[PDB]
Amino acid sequence: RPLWRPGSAPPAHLNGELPGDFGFDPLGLGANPESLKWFAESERVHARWAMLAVAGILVQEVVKPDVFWYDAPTKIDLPFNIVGLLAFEFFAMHFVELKRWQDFRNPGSVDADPLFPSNKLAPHEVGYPGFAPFVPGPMEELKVKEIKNGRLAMLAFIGFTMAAQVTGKGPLAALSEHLADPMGTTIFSKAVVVPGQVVQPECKIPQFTDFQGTKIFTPCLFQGLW
Amino acid sequence: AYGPDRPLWYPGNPAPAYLDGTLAGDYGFDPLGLSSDPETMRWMVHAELQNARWAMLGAAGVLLTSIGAAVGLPFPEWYEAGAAPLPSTVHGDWSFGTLTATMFLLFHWAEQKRIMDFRNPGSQGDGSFFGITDDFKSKENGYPGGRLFDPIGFSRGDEAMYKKYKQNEIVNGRLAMVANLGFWAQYAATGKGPIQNLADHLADPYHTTFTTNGVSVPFY
Amino acid sequence: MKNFTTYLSTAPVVALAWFTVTAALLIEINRFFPDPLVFS
Amino acid sequence: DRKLWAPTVDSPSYLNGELAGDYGFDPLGLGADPVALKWYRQSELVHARWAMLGVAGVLGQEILRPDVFWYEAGEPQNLPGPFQNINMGGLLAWEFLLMHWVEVRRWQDYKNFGSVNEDPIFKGNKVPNPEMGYPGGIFDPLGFSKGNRKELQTKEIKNGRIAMIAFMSFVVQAQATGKGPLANLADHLSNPGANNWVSNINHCVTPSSVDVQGLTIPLTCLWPGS
Ligand code: CLA
Ligand code: CLA
Ligand code: CLA
Ligand SMILES: CC1=C[C@H](O)CC(C)(C)[C@H]1/C=C/C(C)=C/C=C/C(C)=C/C=C/C=C(C)/C=C/C=C(C)/C=C/C1=C(C)C[C@H](O)CC1(C)C
Ligand SMILES: CC1=C[C@H](O)CC(C)(C)[C@H]1/C=C/C(C)=C/C=C/C(C)=C/C=C/C=C(C)/C=C/C=C(C)/C=C/C1=C(C)C[C@H](O)CC1(C)C
Ligand SMILES: CC1=C[C@H](O)CC(C)(C)[C@H]1/C=C/C(C)=C/C=C/C(C)=C/C=C/C=C(C)/C=C/C=C(C)/C=C/C1=C(C)C[C@H](O)CC1(C)C
């Protein structure tokens, strides 16, 4: 089994069955088996949401390079009122999340169309609803690609947000700024903490961003610890 | 710790009988036999697992707000973060008298349940509070494990990690308690609050000691 | 400590404590509410 | 029997003579625990190999480029070629990750000897690493360990121990006189009695602090300056 650090010893709890296991639990978080099962659902859900997000942020910068992803909501004209969009979004997400969770709670209970009992999802593993019209390659191989791709995406998002707080531009603009002066755009080249001095990158995010007349508090993640 | 040959406080001096070495951070240190009684030990262990935990949170705050005020971020220093105006609430404005009363009221409820389980183990786990039972049980004195107090499951997981984690907590808590006396004593001598005292000591390390502060050494 | 607490329970020690608390209470009461001649 | 550090001493048992340069010199009994001896040895070898490189650079740099004071050569402007006034933060970035990989890999050879020996990216390419601290292979290209490596190891440790002592001389005799290693030899040979440690130890000749590209770096002399 490939390990996060060659020569390391994987923790007992990680015998390896979950796709993308690399014996990485330095603090032993998923020591409890049920806890590991939950964390496993969290990892997949986080990765899939992040994978869609990272892609969207990049696309919404190739198509509309003007609107900044961080302040996109305040820079875009919603076809519907936020209250109405948020209301629908809440009920929509609430429904899918409830059925999604019920499966994790009691496996194989929500695996059927409630409106049309004729429709019923085939038996499936938790975390994998069953929507697999096309699977290009071994399921486990694609599972590892999904978790590896997802883990990379989740890290990329934090990078998108932090870069958007240190600089005031999106991922593509920031990367170009790096490609222009590679040895003078790194975080080290913009922030240094010496035993006596404290140079921290300026927060390019207004503490509060007004939205449709409602100033929305937008804090720079731990601006005090940079 | 967690050993019969655990490192002790005064290498050479034998450890107290009551201090076997099981208790977290046990170094056989009870010179005035304060915990000679076994029941006293249990109470003292719980009390330490109470002062240290609060002290740890308090130290995290005096350090985070201080770090902020030094970087520039509007943060009142620990000493003046009480006269700071209380924030408003959707319900209404906050009043100091109500704030104190609410703080004690809530604390009385939690303290009662904690002490009641301490006196009567599992007493709180009677589904009396909305059916919560095992989550209201106590894995050990000062260790109220469950799915509400240890959500991630360090206690439910590897005991070695749990035991190691228990030592980390005791040692860190004792340090935080000592650190807190510092934050207070350095204030009541320098009048500046930490992170300013760390910054002064790192700018003139030799001429910025406790000896040169007026209050510490009176003659000097 | 079991035998130290036993000593701190002996009549002379307990009386010294009880009285000190009672005395201090009356002193503190007059300290904040002085000249209590009548119950008004 | 091996010759020991003093004509009257008796070697500590743990120092049986296996390690190179075993002159039974452990007055503080630091290497008594076999784990610590193992670690300390790796630290000795790393410190020696780094000081032998260092004592060559100080001497060499002076011989060739004599304008730059060894003590003041890490300044961006002092840096030669284009390196002059190069963002030190960006430079640190390179010196950081690159050093972190080589060091961590070496550390994992301590934690699990002969475990990190194969090229992680490519494959098959492996290093003999016969002894911890002596990888050989690509690390020994011209192949001189193939002979009596132990004898060569003895020369290496003895030369390194002399260097370690010499580089800390270069450091002191430079922060006192203000001149390099061979310049201090020249001054002595000019007027011996008048250019000694007596007429030079009463002054810490070297800046109290150095601002590097906006980052002030405090400096100090090993002996409290008179
Ligand atoms: C989205 C959150 C998330 C969650 C819930 C998990 C959960 C899990 N991971 Mg995982 N991981 C994540 C993100 C996450 N991971 C990311 C982003 C990476 C890329 C670095 C990895 C890389 C990784 C590897 C290589 C391995 C795991 C493994 C595991 C499983 C066992 C380890 C464990 O129990 O830790 C539980 C994890 C959590 C409880 C979440 C931690 C949340 C804390 C509170 C946040 C702390 C800060 C955090 C590091 C964010 C940093 C932000 C910034 C500094 C970049 C477990 C079910 C092991 C495995 O596959 O076994 C099956 C394993 O080998 N993960
Ligand atoms: C896949 C993750 C990833 C990648 C590829 C990058 C890439 C880059 N980052 Mg970045 N970053 C990341 C995550 C990542 N970051 C995260 C999670 C954070 C929050 C802690 C940050 C916070 C951050 C700041 C504040 C800044 C950058 C900056 C930069 C650019 C170079 C300058 C620099 O200082 O880099 C430094 C890199 C870091 C500070 C963190 C990267 C560490 C990642 C997570 C490890 C990934 C290792 C793995 C082998 C992947 C390798 C990369 C690639 C093969 C995918 C560069 C293109 C600078 C910039 O914006 O340029 C103008 C800069 O200001 N990043
Ligand atoms: C950091 C450098 C370093 C390190 C890690 C070691 C480590 C070791 N040496 Mg060693 N040695 C060194 C430098 C070093 N040496 C130098 C420069 C010399 C030349 C004088 C020697 C000469 C020497 C001899 C003759 C012998 C050893 C031996 C040993 C081993 C005995 C176990 C021990 O006591 O470890 C502990 C040692 C350390 C932890 C080194 C740290 C130094 C301590 C903490 C303080 C020293 C400060 C020092 C006086 C400052 C000098 C300044 C000056 C140059 C201006 C051990 C593994 C014995 C051996 O070979 O066994 C196989 C032995 O016979 N060494
Ligand atoms: C064991 C033994 C035995 C023998 O026999 C005898 C003897 C010796 C006596 C003993 C010993 C003992 C000891 C040492 C003790 C100590 C303790 C401590 C220090 C504590 C702390 C303690 C400390 C603590 C708690 C702390 C606390 C704090 C808190 C909560 C908080 C605070 C704050 C903050 C956040 C900030 C803001 O702005 C303000 C405030 C609000 C103010
Ligand atoms: C239960 C649970 C369960 C689940 O499952 C999971 C989880 C959630 C994870 C868990 C939790 C946990 C926790 C809570 C923890 C905490 C911690 C802390 C905060 C600590 C502190 C800690 C803190 C501390 C130590 C403190 C420290 C401090 C100090 C020393 C001081 C220092 C100093 C002083 C004197 C003053 C000056 O001027 C400055 C200086 C020099 C700087
Ligand atoms: C054995 C024993 C045993 C018993 O038990 C105890 C006792 C006796 C204590 C012990 C002893 C010990 C010792 C002696 C130690 C020593 C150490 C040292 C001296 C090191 C050095 C060390 C040193 C070193 C590393 C060096 C380093 C250096 C380097 C990297 C570099 C430099 C430089 C050069 C090139 C040039 C440029 O332009 C600049 C720079 C960059 C600045």
Side-chain angles (χ1 to χ4, degrees):
Chain A
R1 174 212 310 186
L3 293 182
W4 69 273
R5 182 241 303 180
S8 66
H13 49 260
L14 295 184
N15 332 275
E17 281 97 22
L18 307 82
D21 188 0
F22 301 109
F24 177 76
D25 216 352
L27 310 181
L29 301 192
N32 181 43
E34 297 73 22
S35 298
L36 187 55
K37 302 166 54 182
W38 173 260
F39 305 148
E41 256 290 358
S42 299
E43 201 168 13
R44 298 188 299 273
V45 175
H46 269 98
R48 303 179 192 183
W49 273 121
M51 281 185 287
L52 303 174
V54 295
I57 301 181
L58 303 172
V59 171
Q60 302 167 25
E61 230 81 12
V62 182
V63 173
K64 277 281 260 333
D66 50 353
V67 181
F68 179 32
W69 71 270
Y70 212 96
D71 54 4
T74 63
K75 299 183 58 180
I76 59 85
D77 48 354
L78 294 165
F80 314 102
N81 201 5
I82 4 79
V83 288
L85 284 170
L86 187 56
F88 166 95
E89 172 176 343
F90 159 76
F91 293 107
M93 192 62 184
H94 199 268
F95 186 94
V96 28
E97 207 78 350
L98 287 192
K99 266 175 181 301
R100 194 221 118 191
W101 141 79
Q102 192 49 236
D103 175 34
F104 182 78
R105 194 179 82 177
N106 309 309
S109 61
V110 283
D111 304 4
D113 180 347
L115 280 66
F116 320 124
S118 60
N119 319 331
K120 178 173 184 181
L121 207 290
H124 64 93
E125 304 177 0
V126 173
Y128 304 102
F131 177 70
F134 169 67
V135 182
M139 221 304 189
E140 283 299 341
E141 150 181 330
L142 273 291
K143 288 180 176 182
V144 176
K145 295 170 169 183
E146 185 168 6
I147 188 58
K148 287 183 56 183
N149 280 298
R151 288 173 176 177
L152 180 57
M154 296 188 294
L155 300 174
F157 181 75
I158 311 305
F160 294 142
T161 67
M162 231 49 61
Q165 291 179 160
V166 168
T167 81
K169 44 201 58 181
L172 310 176
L175 175 53
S176 64
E177 158 183 320
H178 186 58
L179 284 184
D181 192 15
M183 323 229 167
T185 46
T186 69
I187 174 55
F188 288 16
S189 297
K190 60 216 311 178
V192 178
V193 176
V194 115
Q197 292 189 341
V198 171
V199 174
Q200 293 190 0
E202 301 180 358
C203 162
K204 317 303 176 54
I205 305 304
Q207 197 180 28
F208 295 73
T209 63
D210 184 357
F211 166 80
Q212 301 182 356
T214 64
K215 301 181 180 180
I216 312 299
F217 174 53
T218 54
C220 265
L221 274 174
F222 322 86
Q223 216 251 289
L225 302 172
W226 285 354
Chain B
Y2 307 119
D5 307 358
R6 68 195 192 273
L8 293 185
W9 81 280
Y10 199 7
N13 261 170
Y18 41 90
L19 301 186
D20 55 354
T22 59
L23 305 173
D26 188 358
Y27 305 101
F29 173 72
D30 185 10
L32 304 174
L34 303 187
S35 73
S36 300
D37 310 352
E39 303 180 0
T40 297
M41 284 252 54
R42 170 184 172 87
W43 174 260
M44 293 305 181
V45 169
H46 201 207
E48 200 171 10
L49 289 174
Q50 296 297 153
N51 295 245
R53 285 192 174 111
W54 286 120
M56 280 185 279
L57 298 172
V62 183
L63 285 180
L64 184 62
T65 67
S66 276
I67 277 163
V71 174
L73 269 324
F75 281 90
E77 289 268 344
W78 77 272
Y79 42 95
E80 48 174 35
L86 297 179
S88 62
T89 299
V90 295
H91 314 295
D93 193 5
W94 260 113
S95 59
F96 182 85
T98 299
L99 183 62
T100 63
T102 62
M103 180 262 304
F104 288 115
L105 242 175
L106 303 177
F107 259 93
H108 209 296
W109 183 277
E111 297 288 27
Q112 285 293 160
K113 303 187 62 60
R114 179 178 64 91
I115 191 55
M116 282 307 302
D117 196 317
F118 184 77
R119 301 174 176 179
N120 179 7
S123 60
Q124 306 309 300
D126 48 345
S128 48
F129 196 85
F130 306 139
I132 310 175
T133 58
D134 304 2
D135 291 4
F136 278 161
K137 272 55 161 296
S138 52
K139 198 279 182 56
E140 300 160 349
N141 120 81
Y143 294 88
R147 282 126 68 207
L148 285 184
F149 296 112
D150 186 26
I152 304 213
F154 299 91
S155 59
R156 307 188 299 264
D158 238 83
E159 246 296 348
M161 250 305 189
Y162 172 59
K163 283 298 165 291
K164 178 197 129 65
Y165 273 128
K166 299 171 61 177
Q167 185 73 202
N168 296 128
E169 192 167 15
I170 279 296
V171 185
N172 294 219
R174 290 177 175 177
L175 178 57
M177 293 189 294
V178 167
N180 266 285
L181 200 59
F183 297 147
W184 307 340
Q186 303 190 12
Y187 176 50
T190 75
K192 306 279 274 317
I195 247 80
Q196 222 130 84
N197 289 327
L198 180 70
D200 297 348
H201 191 67
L202 269 159
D204 208 3
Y206 316 112
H207 312 100
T208 60
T209 66
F210 74 92
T211 65
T212 309
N213 85 346
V215 182
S216 302
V217 182
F219 23 93
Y220 179 76
Chain C
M1 189 80 156
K2 170 228 331 141
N3 295 115
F4 189 33
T5 54
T6 307
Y7 170 84
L8 308 174
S9 308
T10 59
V13 182
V14 159
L16 184 275
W18 195 252
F19 290 136
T20 300
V21 178
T22 304
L25 172 59
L26 299 177
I27 301 171
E28 298 299 68
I29 289 177
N30 292 181
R31 191 162 65 94
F32 297 94
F33 305 70
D35 307 329
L37 184 53
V38 288
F39 181 63
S40 67
Chain D
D1 183 69
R2 42 205 245 264
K3 259 210 181 177
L4 265 4
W5 67 277
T8 42
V9 89
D10 235 303
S11 80
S13 54
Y14 42 94
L15 298 188
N16 292 288
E18 297 77 6
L19 291 184
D22 211 326
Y23 289 86
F25 180 67
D26 192 353
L28 288 72
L30 293 172
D33 179 30
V35 203
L37 188 52
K38 298 170 52 190
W39 176 267
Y40 296 161
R41 191 64 187 180
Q42 312 306 303
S43 193
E44 189 176 46
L45 287 176
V46 172
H47 263 95
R49 289 154 153 158
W50 270 125
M52 295 192 253
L53 270 181
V55 88
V58 188
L59 282 171
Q61 172 193 358
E62 172 163 338
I63 285 161
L64 297 183
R65 220 179 136 175
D67 33 272
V68 266
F69 181 29
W70 153 81
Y71 212 99
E72 306 135 2
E75 311 299 354
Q77 51 280 358
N78 300 167
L79 278 169
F83 310 121
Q84 175 180 181
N85 291 334
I86 192 58
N87 189 313
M88 299 305 298
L91 170 61
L92 179 61
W94 282 107
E95 200 269 2
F96 175 67
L97 296 173
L98 304 181
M99 284 298 307
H100 199 273
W101 180 274
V102 311
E103 285 292 63
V104 167
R105 291 286 304 185
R106 175 182 62 92
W107 165 77
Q108 244 289 138
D109 131 272
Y110 178 68
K111 263 35 209 72
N112 209 358
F113 174 67
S115 185
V116 272
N117 277 0
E118 196 150 54
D119 180 353
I121 301 190
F122 299 94
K123 221 33 120 288
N125 296 305
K126 77 148 298 175
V127 165
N129 189 12
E131 295 175 347
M132 190 171 58
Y134 294 96
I138 193 56
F139 297 102
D140 189 28
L142 311 179
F144 299 147
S145 63
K146 47 75 187 301
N148 183 355
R149 180 185 43 163
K150 178 53 184 299
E151 197 278 355
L152 247 149
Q153 290 177 344
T154 303
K155 294 190 172 301
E156 183 175 8
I157 196 56
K158 288 171 59 178
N159 277 277
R161 290 169 176 179
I162 303 177
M164 279 191 253
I165 283 204
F167 180 80
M168 296 298 303
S169 158
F170 291 23
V171 173
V172 177
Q173 65 178 49
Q175 52 182 189
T177 73
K179 310 183 187 67
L182 300 157
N184 293 336
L185 181 60
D187 296 330
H188 189 57
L189 292 167
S190 307
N191 34 13
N195 271 340
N196 273 336
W197 62 273
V198 166
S199 304
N200 294 150
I201 199 55
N202 52 352
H203 44 82
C204 159
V205 176
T206 19
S208 62
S209 62
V210 44
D211 183 8
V212 178
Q213 294 185 347
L215 182 72
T216 296
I217 299 184
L219 313 175
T220 184
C221 278
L222 293 176
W223 79 106
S226 301

